[PDB]
Amino acid sequence: TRVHSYRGVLIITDELTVEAGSRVSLSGYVSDGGTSDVFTICRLLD
Amino acid sequence: SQIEASPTIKDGVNASVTGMIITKAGDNDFVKVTSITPTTSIAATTADTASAALASIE
Numbered sequence: 001t002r003v004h005s006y007r008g009v010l011i012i013t014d015e016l017t018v019e020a021g022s023r024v025s026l027s028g029y030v031s032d033g034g035t036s037d038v039f040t041i042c043r044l045l046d
Numbered sequence: 047s048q049i050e051a052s053p054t055i056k057d058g059v060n061a062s063v064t065g066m067i068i069t070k071a072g073d074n075d076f077v078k079v080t081s082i083t084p085t086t087s088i089a090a091t092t093a094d095t096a097s098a099a100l101a102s103i104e
Contacts, residue, residue, distance in 0.1 A: 006062045 075102070 049061050049068070058074030061067065069092060070077045079086045093099035 004065050006064065006067060 049059060050056055058070060058072060059077060060069045060071035067090075068077060068079050093102065
């Protein structure tokens, strides 16, 4: 009788996954003119 | 030392020293040792508790 044993290595298996997300943000409004240069009263003529 | 140095055996055959057991490890799954006079004895099937055998056969 021997009963003699052996020894191995520590083998482990795992599944890893990292995830993320996305969101789009928008801000708009109906045009009521716009930032202009030389905002002055005018007198058009044809 | 010799069994871990053969160019075509080095990978796939895991061995020990006791006080040896030529098992399999990685890639290659099938192993077989045979001699005439000295020993090359026993079977000691690795496939354990069905699951190991089943996982291979599946």
